[PDB]
């Protein structure tokens, strides 16, 4: 064709297109206000209308990077608020992009999004498409490589959720619980993404792949290879389109892909038939979101060609991608019931034996047991997730974030209190999502709701390094991750952190807070006592954590509280220190 920014327009429809513009430009524009960059998207969206009417016109041959990128470039105040973009702006396409992306912020600091029910409830009535696109905005701003098609996708659920409770008698107990819960699945989706964007920029198109394989051969075990390798080949662009920033590409062949499976859902699952019979928007979330399929009754005995056969050396020679791949598709169909990350630490030994074996004497010999090796590595994490959730279902979700607020703080003392805090919070509620599930879901959810967590720690600390051992954890391996940060013990060469009083004073501003605010404060408290006296016991910490939490609690309940923290606080600071020897 002659004008890609009208086949988008054309394709993707106007609604969507402008949703998608306004959120590739808060993405990289974190802090222009929503009613300015409303005004970029409104001229884009004009320039592709006008584009749609006569493909030949000037500029209209422009690629969507070009056209994007010269519109940012427009912005008002650019070298003052965006010194850094301003830089790239001197540059052209692809290197604009790149710089573009360099400089995308994982940790902007705004400011939480605290629902105002009746003052949104009126925005909202006088201006839905205003408030809707602010939603947008917002959410965009704060997760910078969120995916565009799932941000329309929750941007709907907002929408409904205050077309349901704005006419009602109680505006905040309709609202609160439901915008609540679409926050958890903001956090939990963009954590996913920005996974897959870490893979892709750290890892390579081959690692998100292979990560791609494995999981959806768990979710489709009825495809074939053939199915399954196109599917994955087709969603690996997807998101490698949305991580480069072409969100207009991502969303038009996200659809693609959707319409395909949904046209081969005989052949690929038939969990996907609820799925298929929805709109655009909702049939692709649908899809993966889906849930796993029943194994078929004729999955193939695989010892036969991945063990016994006596040409496995020729095999992997002469086809070593697709034979690899398709071991990992076999064995990942096979087991729903292991994490993405332990199905990819299998393949990798797989790999690991052939390389081994077919170099010496008598490889059939040598290969033979290749399976037996896998036994090791499924028990290790199986024992970590039964200790982990035995240990949550004992003492709840507050006292596991503390345990593993403690457990990293030793592995990286040089982290900052909020990350470590943030992490271990973090950490500690795949406990209540995961443990409570039917046994054989918990390895899977566990081991792959770490990741996401560890992929946020190592985001950070690309922006932030203070710890060579977490740099190698971080960049080493994807697979080999969450075992890397596992065996990390306390960093021995360490420098206790010097005593600070003011840091574990509390006061009366405490009080005042809501529950889960609170006991941010206490956590914060806790990791500094760690950095403060590393060699310290959990279960030291965990006795001088409560003494100031009973400490906390006395002194919110006094009628005069600020000398109740002014008497008591000061003893409780000086003891601790002779409790943490
Ligand atoms: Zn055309
Ligand atoms: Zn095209
Ligand atoms: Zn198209
Ligand atoms: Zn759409
Ligand atoms: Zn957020
Ligand atoms: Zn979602
Ligand atoms: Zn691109
Ligand atoms: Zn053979
Ligand atoms: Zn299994
Ligand atoms: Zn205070």
Do not use: M
């Not at 005042?512 to 609170?518: A, G, I, Q, S, V």
């Amino acid at each position: 064709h002659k004008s890609e920014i009208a086949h988008r327009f054309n394709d993707l429809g106007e609604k969507h297109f402008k949703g998608l513009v306004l959120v590739a430009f808060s993405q990289y524009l974190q802090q222009c206000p929503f009613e300015d960059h409303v005004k970029l998207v409104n001229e884009v969206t004009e320039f592709a209308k006008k584009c749609a009417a006569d493909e030949s016109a000037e500029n209209c041959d422009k690629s969507l990077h070009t056209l994007f990128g010269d519109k940012l470039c427009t912005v008002a105040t650019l070298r003052a608020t965006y010194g850094e973009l301003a830089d790239c702006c001197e540059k052209q396409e692809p290197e604009r992009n790149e710089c573009f992306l360099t400089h995308k912020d994982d940790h902007p600091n705004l400011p939480k999004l605290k629902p105002e029910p009746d003052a949104q409830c009126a925005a909202f009535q006088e201006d839905p498409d205003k408030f809707l696109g602010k939603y947008l905005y917002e959410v965009a701003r704060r997760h910078p490589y969120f995916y565009g098609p799932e941000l329309l996708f929750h941007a709907e659920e907002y929408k409904a959720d205050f077309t349901e409770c704005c006419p009602a008698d109680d505006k905040l107990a309709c609202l609160i619980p439901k915008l609540d819960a679409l926050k958890e699945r903001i956090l939990l989706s963009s954590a996913k993404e920005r996974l897959k964007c870490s893979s892709f920029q750290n890892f390579g198109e081959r690692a998100v792949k292979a990560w791609s394989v494995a999981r959806l051969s768990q979710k489709f075990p009825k495809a074939d290879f053939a199915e399954v390798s196109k599917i994955v080949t087709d969603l690996t662009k997807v998101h490698k389109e949305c991580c480069h920033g072409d969100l207009l590409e991502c969303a038009d062949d996200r659809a693609d892909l959707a319409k395909y499976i949904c046209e081969h859902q005989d052949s690929i699952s038939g969990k996907l038939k609820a799925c298929c019979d929805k709109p655009l928007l909702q049939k692709s979330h649908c899809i993966a979101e889906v849930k796993e399929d029943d194994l078929p009754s004729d999955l193939p005995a695989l010892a036969a060609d991945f063990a016994e056969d006596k040409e496995i050396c020729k095999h992997y020679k002469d086809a070593k991608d697709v034979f690899l791949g398709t071991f990992l598709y076999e064995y990942s169909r096979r087991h729903p019931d292991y994490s993405v990350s332990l199905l990819l630490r299998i393949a990798k030994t797989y790999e690991a034996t052939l390389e081994k074996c077919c170099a010496e004497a008598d490889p059939p010999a040598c290969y033979r047991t290749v399976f037996d090796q896998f036994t090791p590595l499924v028990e290790e994490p199986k024992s970590l997730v039964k200790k982990n959730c035995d240990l949550f279902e004992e003492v709840g979700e507050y006292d596991f974030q503390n345990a593993l607020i403690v457990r990293y703080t030793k592995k990286a003392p040089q982290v900052s209190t909020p990350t470590l805090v943030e992490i271990g919070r973090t950490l500690g509620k795949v406990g209540s999502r995961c443990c409570k599930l039917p046994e054989s879901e918990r390895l899977p959810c566990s081991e792959n709701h770490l990741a996401l967590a560890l992929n946020r720690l190592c985001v950070l600390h690309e922006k932030t390094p203070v710890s060579e051992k977490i740099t190698k954890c971080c960049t080493d391996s994807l697979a080999e991750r969450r075992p890397c940060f596992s065996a990390l013990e306390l960093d021995e060469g360490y420098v206790p952190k010097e005593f600070k009083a003011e840091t574990f004073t509390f006061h009366a501003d405490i009080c005042t807070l809501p529950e889960d605010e609170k006991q941010i404060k206490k956590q914060s408290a806790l990791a500094e006592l760690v950095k403060h006296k590393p060699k310290a016991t959990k279960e030291q910490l965990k006795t001088v954590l409560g003494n100031f939490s009973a400490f906390v609690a006395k002194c919110c309940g006094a009628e005069d509280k600020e000398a109740c923290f002014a008497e008591e606080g000061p003893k409780l600071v000086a003891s601790s220190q002779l409790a943490l020897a």
